[PDB]
Structure formats: C-alpha cells, structure tokens
Amino acid sequence: RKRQRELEQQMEAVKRGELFTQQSAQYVEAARKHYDAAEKLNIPDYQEKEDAFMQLVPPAVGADIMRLFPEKSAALMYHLGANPEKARQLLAMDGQSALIELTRLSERL
Amino acid sequence: RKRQRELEQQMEAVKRGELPESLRVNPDLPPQPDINAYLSEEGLAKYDYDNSRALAAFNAANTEWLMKAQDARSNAVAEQGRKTQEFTQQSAQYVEAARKHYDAAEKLNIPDYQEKEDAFMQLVPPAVGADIMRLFPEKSAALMYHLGANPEKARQLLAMDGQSALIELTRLSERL
Amino acid sequence: RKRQRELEQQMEAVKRGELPESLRVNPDLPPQPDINAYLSEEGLAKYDYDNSRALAAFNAANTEWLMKAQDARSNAVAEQGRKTQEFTQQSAQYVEAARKHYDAAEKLNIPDYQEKEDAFMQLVPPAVGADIMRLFPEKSAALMYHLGANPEKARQLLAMDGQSALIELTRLSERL
Amino acid sequence: RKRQRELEQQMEAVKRGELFTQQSAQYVEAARKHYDAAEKLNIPDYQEKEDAFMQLVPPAVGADIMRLFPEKSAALMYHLGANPEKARQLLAMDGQSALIELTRLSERL
Amino acid sequence: RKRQRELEQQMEAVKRGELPESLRVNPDLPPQPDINAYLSEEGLAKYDYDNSRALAAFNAANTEWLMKAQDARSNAVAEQGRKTQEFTQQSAQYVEAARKHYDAAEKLNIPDYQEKEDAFMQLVPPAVGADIMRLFPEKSAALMYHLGANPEKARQLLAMDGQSALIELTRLSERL
Amino acid sequence: RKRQRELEQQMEAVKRGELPESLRVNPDLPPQPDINAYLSEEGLAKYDYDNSRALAAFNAANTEWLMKAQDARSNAVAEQGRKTQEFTQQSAQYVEAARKHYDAAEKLNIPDYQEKEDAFMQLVPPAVGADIMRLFPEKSAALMYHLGANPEKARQLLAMDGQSALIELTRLSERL
Amino acid sequence: RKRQRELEQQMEAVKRGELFTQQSAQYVEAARKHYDAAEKLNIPDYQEKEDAFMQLVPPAVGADIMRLFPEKSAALMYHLGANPEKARQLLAMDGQSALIELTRLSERL
Amino acid sequence: RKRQRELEQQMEAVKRGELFTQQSAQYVEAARKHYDAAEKLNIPDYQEKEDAFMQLVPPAVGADIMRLFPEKSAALMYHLGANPEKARQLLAMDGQSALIELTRLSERL
C-alpha cells in the first residue's frame, strides 16, 4: 500500500500545482485497475518480481505497459519477471518483439 | 515496379557508400580547460602565490584535453563504423523488403495493390511503412488493402504513434 | 593499335602505383601562432602585466597547433587515399575506353577511323575526348567522323567549352 | 518583374563599388535572354516551379544552368520542376547525370 | 618431398603473420632539439639577453619534434604495411616455387634431382637459388644437374655474385 | 550430459564476448616525471641557476610521458586483442573437448565414466584436467578410470605439479 | 669439473647469506645425481651438446628438466641435442610437447 | 681522357675528405676496366653513343651496368646506343627486360 501512497502523493502534488499531467492522471486510474488485476492474479509472490522489474527497466517502458493493458498488466509483468532472461534480451532488443510476447500473454487470456 | 526500381536504386546508392553530409557524425570535442581563469594571478593566490602550480596543472590540463579530444575523434570513427554497419543491416532488411514486394506481386494477385499502396504512402510517414514491411512482409499488401477499406481507421492510424499501430495491426492481422 | 598500346601501357603504369610528384598532395599545414607578437611585454600588458598568462596561452597555442598540423597531415594521407581511389576509378573507365576501342574496331569497320581520330586529338584537348569516349563509347568513332566532315563545326567545338561542346556532341548524336 | 528589379538592384550595387563581377554581369545578360526564353516557353504557370527550384537547389547550380544554356534555360527548369523527383535524386546524385538530362532536354529541341 | 613440406610449412607460417622480431621495423625517431644548448644564457645573449625568445623557439622546437616523431611513427606503420605486402608477394612467388617443384617432379623425371639439389643448396646461398627458381622455374632442375656435372663451374658460381651468376645461369640455359 | 551442457553454455557465453572485469587488462601507465623535484630551485642550481632549462626539460618530459602513456594504452588495446584471440583459440580447443566427450560417450561405452570423472574433478584442479583432455582426448576416460582404480596414485597426482602429473599420465598411457 | 665448482661456489655464497634457496639446494643434489647419470650415459662427447643446450634454452626450462628427472636427465639432454631441430621447434612451441618427447625418452628406458 | 680526368678528380676529392665511398672506389676500378673493354671494342665512333647514353639514362642505371659487367660494358652500351629505340622503351619499361638484352649481349660473347 506504500507504493500506492507515494504515487498518490506525487500525483496530488502535481494536481496542487507543483509542476504532462493528463497522462499522469490516466496513470493513477490505470494503477487502480493495475492493482485490481494484481488481485485478479492472486499469486502473493509478485512483489519481488515487480520490484525487480522497476529496478531493471526504465520507468518509461514500464509506464507504457502499465497504461496499455489495464486488465492484464499484473500477469504480464509477473510472467516476464518469471522469464527475466527475455527481459534483458529485450533490453538489448527493440521493444517490438517484447510487445509481441506481451500480445501472446494476452493470447493465453 | 517503378517504385520498387527507385527503392532498389537507393539500395545500390547506399551499398557503394553514398553517405549524406547530414549522416557524417561530427566528433563531439569536449571543451578545453580555460587559460586565463586557471593560470592567472587569482589561480596563483589559490596555489600559494606562484606561477608554478598554475603552469604545472595547465600542462596537465593540456595533456588531459589532448587525450579526451583524441578519444572523441577515435569514437567519432567508432560510431562512424557503427553507422556503416547499421547501413549494412538496413540494406539487408530492405533487400528482404524488395524480395517480399516480389513475393507479394507473385502471391497476392487479388487486390489493386498499386493505388492502395500509394494512398498508404501518402497517409503515414515512411518509417511506419518500413516497420510494417519489415515485420509483416507478406501480409503488408492485404493490410494496406484493409486499411484503405477503412479510411476512418486510417486517420486514427495517422493521428497516433507508430509503435502502437504495430499491434492493433498485429491485432488486426490476427483478427483476420 | 599503337595508340591503344600506349594508352594501355599508361594504364599498367598507373595500376602499379607510378604516381608523379605533381600528384603527391603536399599537406597544407596551417600557420603556427606567432611567438613574439603574443608572448611579449605587450601581451603581458594585455594580461595584467605578467609573463604568466602569456606562457599559459602560448602552451595552449602550441598544443592546438600540434593537433591542427596533425589533422592536416592525417588529411593529407586521407586525400592521398582518395586520390588513389580516383586513380582506380579512372583506370576502370579507361579499361572500358580500351574495350570500347576494341568494340569500335570490331563493329564500325566503315570509316577511315585512324586519321580522323588523329585530327580530333590534334584539335580538341584530351579531356574533352576522354569525356566523349566515357559517355559515348561506341558512337565516338562515327562522331569524330561527322566532326571531321564538318571542320567549321570542328573549330566551333575548339573555340567553346567541353561541357558545352558535348551538347553538340549529344544533340548531334540524336540528330542522326 | 520584381525578381528582375531586385537582381538589377544587386548588380547595380555591385557596379557602384559595393563589393567576381564579370560573371555576375554575364548573369545579368543571361537573365535577360533567360526571360526571353521564358516568353518562348509561354506556359504561364512556370513561376511556382521556378520558385520551388530556387528554394530546393543551391544558387550555385541554378546559376550554372542559367549561364550554360541561354536559349533553353526556362524550358529546362520548367521540365525539371515538372519531374522534381529526379531533381531530388540528383540532389543526392552527382551533377553529371543531371547534366545528361539537361542535354536530353536540349535533344528534344 | 620433405624439403617441399618444410618450405610450404614456412609458407603457412608466413601467411598467418608469424613475423620475427628482427623483421619488426623500429621507428627511426629523429633527435629532439637540445634543451640546455638552446635555452640557456648563451641563447639569451644570442636573442638580445632575454629568456623570451628562448622559450618561444623551444616551444616551437617541441612542436616540430612532436610532428616529426609523429611522422616517424606513422612511417614505421607505413613501411610495416609495405613489409607485410612484400611478404604477401614473396609468399605468392614461393607458391609458384612450390608449384614449379611439383611441375619439375611431374615433367623432368630424368635426373637424380634430390642429391644434386642438395649439393646446390650446400654450395650457393639460398637467395641465389630463390632467384633461379623464381625466374627459371621449370629448367632449375636441369640447371642444377648441369652445374653438378661441372663442379669447377660450380665453385666459380660460388666465388662470384648472384646477379652475374645468373647470366651464367641464363646464357648457359640458352647455350643448351 | 549436464556437465557437457554447462561446459558448452560457458562456451557460447565466451563466444559472444562476455568478458569478466578481472580479464579486462588495465593499462600499465608508467609514472610521470616529478614536478617539484625537477623544476625547483635545486634544479635551477643544477642548470646554472635559471628557470629556463627547468621549463625546457619539463616540457620535454611532458611530451615523452604523453608518448609513453599513449604507447601504454595502445598496448593495452593490443594485448586486449591478443587476449580476445586466445579466448578464440581456447574456445576452439574446448570445442574439440566437447566433441571428444561426444566421442568418448560414443566409443568407450565400457566404464562407469560419470562418477569416476566426478571424482577426478573433485581431486585435481580443472587446469590439469583441461590439459589432459586437450592432449589426450579419447583416452582421458580410460585414464580417469585407471586413476580411480589407483587412489594412492591419485593423491600422488594431487600432491605434485601438472606438467609432471601429466608425465605420469603419458607414460602410464604407453604402459597400457 | 669447473661447472660443478662454479655451481657449488654460487650455492655456498647463497648459503653464506649473500642473497628461493630450498629449490637451489635441491638443484645441488639433483646436479650430483645429474652427473651420476652422465657417467651412466658414458658417451664422452656430451659436453658440447650440453653447452649448446645451455646457450639455446633459457636457464628456467633446463633447470626444470634437471630437477624433474634425476636418473635420466643426462640422456634426455644428450638426445635432444642430438635432434636440436625439435629443440628449436619447441622453442617456438609450448613446452608440453617437449615434455612428451622427454616422456618418450623415459619410455625407451 | 677528359672524362677520366674529371672522374678521377671527383674521386680524389672524395678520398681527400670532401664528403658511400667504397662503391665509388670500385667504380674507379670498373671504369679502368671499362676503358680497357672500350679498347677491346675498337670501333672509334662509340664516343657520341656513350654521350647520348649518359644524357638519356639517369646516372644510376648507367652506373649499375658499368659495375655489373667489367669485361663487356663498352660493347653493351655501344650496341644499346645502336638501338636506342629499345633504350627509350626500357626507359618506359622496368629494368628487368633491359637486363635481359644485356644478358643476350653477353650471350653473343
């Protein structure tokens, strides 16, 4: 709940005028549905995997996948952290093929 | 065919080494340490009121600037070679682009591909089309056909970024 | 044949690397910054009456002259290699020149090519003839024949520029 | 007539001593025969094509073609602006082949 | 065959780049201008009794020594490449040497070539034999045979220079 | 198989260029000549009591340190390339190591090779085993078998050096 | 006997404190058994061969073979000086294969 | 005799210390045997031919042939000046084939 609290603190500082804001607001809502989908995942070990994700990808690509797929995002990062070898190969590779594995993760559901 | 002919002519232009001046990577020489600011009487007052340490560390600064500018020019050569190699791989994937255009003319044979391709070129930037033909070579013709059948979808695609387009397209492809 | 023999002998002379001293590109070393003008008492009076900044910026000037003269000599090597490559491409297009002279002797067979070619060589500078044989290899013989049939046109061509002359060459060719 | 006026103003400033002048004078006369050849063309839509020409080629090559061919220059630029795809390909290419199309434009006349 | 095997093994040793330390061309760095001799009080007395011109021209001397030593090392690289190319052409002509030894074993078939070749190797320096096999490949076997038939002529050839010996070789060849 | 799988996986790790930081050869920059010790008043008293020769030879020392540090870094690159080439040749001889492990599994087929190989790995350092498999590839399995049949000989081999431990290996091989 | 005298002089200087000493002492004893094996060889022409050996190999490898094989060392160097072509090829080659010929020299005895 | 006098003057200046000298001395002796061979030729018209030779070849190649063939040099240059067409063709050609005609001149004698 602490990460939600700090994200909400940053966003309320943004809306208070402590200055590009519209997408951040959509990221607030997409994070709400993100943790909804995290409950939908219901494998309580995903916290270390998502910690590893934020520490290994830049915030930009994580934000992109966070906003793209509101209903499957938690499972997407959980299973790409399950196979982080492909995560680093896609750190070397262009994001199009990583996007393809994201789409196949959509394919299973 | 004429569009393919100009594409392949650009290809042999690239393969020989016709590299535009804009593509010439100019070395980013780091600034040299200043002369007056360091080795003036104020610098002497820093270093116990003597010209000695000023000349010492300025000779050292000369040397370090020499090595960092040398590394800058050697880099300039290095990413010039890297740019040459990325022209080579571009050229390769454009060879498969020309070959898949041959393949589309060989296999598709159903639609009015010429004018729909013209409309798609006129609509989207060439980079998006290049990515489409690189990742979806054989279906690119049918994809342009279905996009031409949907001009409303076409100017969504115009209004929005190339990568996204990828999927939704990829998607659209797997919807069909 | 003897003219072709001397042309091809010049060719093997070029291919081995017989490069005349006039073709040796001497490096254009930029002038070094002056010694007395910068680092004298007048320079000291510029820089708050001290030998300090004078020695500082003169060491800096030494360093920058070292790098610019180094870049000058490295360039001299670079355009020496460029000149070698342009000798190679010349040599190539002169190989097609000798081969098209073979082709003219093989195909034309109609005119008195030797003396008309001699007259054309005696009239125009060799550069114009080289450009003519490079761009219009097979028709060059008939072109010299028709020019010899028109001495008045011949000394117009003599009086006027090479690029300019060819037009004549070319629109005369498409008149025939 | 405005472009003629500004060219003549620049050239009379040059001849007044406001400083390479001999070729500029020959360019004055070659521009006179240029607009003579423009009347010889007599397709009144060439103004936008020649505007595009000056804005896409450097002044040097336009000057070269202007001085080379006094009697056909207007038609030369009109028809190379008709096909400006070859104009940009020759911006990429050496000027020798562009010169070849100039010569073929001479060939039609 | 074993002599041919060791010759060709030396060949693949050369082709990979096994270059002996004696063949490493050390750069000939020109001497730097002297420090005390130029920029002492005697030099000052030359230049109107002041340290000024001494430091000026010594910085200039530093710069010119930097460029001449740089040209020296760049040359060292240049004739190192030239030496590599002359190893390549040596290697080529030794490839024809091995191939003509094959040809001699194929064609001659008449004499006791092995021991006469051994005697010729034991007599003359290897450079003379290399030149003989380079210019007269096919007849070299019969030439060694006729020289072995003439030991008195053999030790004239030993006593006298390689170029001269050759004519001998050659006008003996055209005597036969 | 799993040991062979990890060996070959290390192989493809090496072939791509995964080079550990310990294998990064740091350049050995020679020390720069000292500043105070040379160009102080004691140095002036050496050179006839003047700052002149001190600045002269210190500029010279700057230049020579620049060239020796430059040669040091160019060397660092040179033995980095040499280290890359020795990784390539290791990789080659480890490719024959994996291939001879295939060959042993194909041909030997008699002994319990897995656990005897495990014991031999646990006993001797990996370098000795690497040399054994490099020089005696096919017999290495039977050699480990006979060593496992002789634990007393095994811990002699442990107690004593690899070149000799090997002797042991080889004259044991020719005893059998 | 002169080489024994100079080796013993160097070693007694070492033991006197004129400075890595333990292996030198073992080299004293291994040289004693070396010349024992030299008598075992009993072909009195080996002196020039061993002179050539010391002048063509570094002292390190000669010392290594001297210490490795106390009972066969004299014959080893006598027969590698008999074939010094292999000696120089092993100067070019790694010492492992030279060691293999040393082992085969052990094989004959 | 004047050319001998000037050559000897240059060589005695060289030996006096007015400075690569050993080959010049051998050239003195080879010139002595050169004019011995010139007497052996005994066709008194060779002076203009050798004047033409020195004025058409560089001194280096003339010196090389002078030193190579002490006994036949005069006839060599006399007959290559007889056919100076081959002399200029070999000015264009590499010296190896000129050397071949020198060898055939040796073949006649």
- Kindly report the nearest CA distance between residue E173 and chain H, in angstroms: 10
Give the residue among F97, F74, F73, F75 at the shortest CA–CA distance from F14. F97
For the record, the structure tokens of F119 come out as: 């014991």
Q: What gap in Å lies between CA F21 and CA G40, rounded to an integer?
A: 54
Q: In this structure, which long-range contacts are made by residues B46-51, counting pairs with CB atoms below 8 Å and at least 24 apart in sequence? A: B51/C50, B51/C51, B51/C52, B51/C55
Measured distance CA(H16)–CA(H24) in Å, rounded: 13
Q: Is the dihedral of CA G91, G92, G96, G99 positive or negative?
A: negative
**Which of F90, F170, F174 has the most G C-beta neighbours within 10 Å, making it the best mutation to test the interface with G?**
F170
For residue B123, the distance in angstroms to the closest alpha carbon of chain A comes to 22
**Which of E52, E67, E71 lies at the smallest CB-CB distance from C40?**
E52
Cβ B59–C55 below 8 Å, yes or no? no
- Partner chains of A (3+ C-beta pairs under 8 Å): B
Per-position DSSP letters for chain C, written without gaps between them: -HHHHHHHHHHHHHHHT---GGGS----PPPPPPSTTTSSHHHHHHTTS-HHHHHHHHHHHHHHHHHHHHHHHHHHHHHHHHHHHHHHHHHHHHHHHHHHHHHHHHHT-SS-HHHHHHHHHHHS-HHHHHHHHHHSTTTHHHHHHHHHT-HHHHHHHHHS-HHHHHHHHHHHHTT-
Residue C103 CB-density burial (10 A; 0-12 exposed, 13-18 middle, 19+ buried):
middle
Residue F76, C-beta contacts closer than 8 angstroms, at least 6 positions apart: F25, F26, F27, F28
Give chains near E: 3+ CB pairs under 8 A: C, F, H
Instruction: Give me the DSSP letters along chain B.
Output: -HHHHHHHHHHHHHHHT---GGGS----PPPPPPSTTTSSHHHHHHTTS-HHHHHHHHHHHHHHHHHHHHHHHHHHHHHHHHHHHHHHHHHHHHHHHHHHHHHHHHHT-SS-HHHHHHHHHHHS-HHHHHHHHHHSTTTHHHHHHHHHT-HHHHHHHHHS-HHHHHHHHHHHHHH-
**What is the distance between the alpha carbons of residues H46 and H77, in angstroms, rounded to a whole number?**
9
Residues of B whose CB is below 8 A from A95? 163
What's the alpha-carbon Rg for chain C, to the nearest Å? Answer: 27
Q: How far is CA A14 from CA A10, A25, A54, F55, in A?
A: 6, 9, 22, 61
Alpha-carbon Rg for chain G in angstroms: 14
Q: What is the 3-state secondary structure (H, E, C) of chain F?
A: CHHHHHHHHHHHHHHHCCCCHHHCCCCCCCCCCCCCCCCCHHHHHHCCCCHHHHHHHHHHHHHHHHHHHHHHHHHHHHHHHHHHHHHHHHHHHHHHHHHHHHHHHHHCCCCCHHHHHHHHHHHCCHHHHHHHHHHCCCCHHHHHHHHHCCHHHHHHHHHCCHHHHHHHHHHHHCCC
The residue among D103, D105, D108 with the most chain C CBs within 10 A of its CB, best to mutate, is D103
Query: What distances in angstroms separate CA C171 from CA C147, D106, E169, G42, H95, one per listed residue?
Result: 13, 7, 64, 101, 49
Q: D18: distance to nearest CA of chain C, Å?
A: 31
The answer to whether the Cβ–Cβ distance between A96 and B171 falls below 8 Å is no
How is residue H15 written in tokens? 């030996």
E37–C contact, CB cutoff 8 A: no
Please tell me the number of Cα atoms within 13 Å of F112 on its side-chain side. 6
Chain F residue numbers with beta carbons less than 8 Å from the beta carbon of G95 are 163
Residue E74 contacts by C-beta under 8 Å, 6 or more apart in sequence? C73, C77
Residues H37, H73: contact at Cβ < 8 Å?
A: yes
Nearest-CB residue to G68 (from F131, F135, F164):
F164
What sign for the dihedral angle of Cα H30, H35, H36, H40?
A: positive
The shortest C-alpha distance from F86 to chain B (Å) reads 24
F168 touching chain G per CB within 8 A: no
Residues 6+ apart with CB under 8 A from G96: F131, F135, F163, F166
- The minimum CA-CA distance between B16 and chain C, rounded to whole Å, is 13
**Using an 8 Å Cβ cutoff, are E10 and G92 in contact?**
no
Alpha helices in E108-125 (DSSP H): 113-123
- E strand segments, E77-173: none
Q: Looking at the complex, does the CB of residue C63 fall below 8 Å from at least one CB of chain B? A: yes
Nearest residue of B to residue C44, measured between CA atoms: B40
String of b and e for G1-28 (b: at least 16 CB within 10 Å)? eeeeeeeeeebeeeeeeeeeeeeeeebb
With CB atoms and an 8 Å threshold, state whether G100 touches F171.
Answer: no
Whether F50 sits inside 8 A of E66 (CB atoms) is no
Residues near G24 by beta carbon (within 8 Å), at least 6 away in sequence:
G11, G14
Q: What count of CB pairs under 8 Å joins A to B?
A: 12
Task: Estimate to the nearest angstrom the gap between the alpha carbon of B94 and the chain centroid.
Answer: 14
Alpha carbon distance F48, G18 (integer Å):
43
F51–chain B Cβ distance below 8 A for any pair = no
C136: left (phi over 0), alpha (psi -120 to 50) or beta: beta
Token code pair at residue A20: 């590009």
Method: cryo-EM
- Tell me if residue G94 falls in helix, strand or coil: coil
Show residues of chain B in contact with F59, CB under 8 Å: 59
Spatial CB neighbours of F123, under 8 Å, sequence gap ≥ 6:
F154, F155, F157, F158
Tell whether B18 lies on the interface with D, counting CB pairs under 8 A: yes
Q: Helices G46-56 & G59-68, crossing angle to 10 degrees?
A: 130
| Residue E123 DSSP SS3 | helix
Q: Residue A51: enclosing H or E segment and its boundaries?
A: helix A46-56
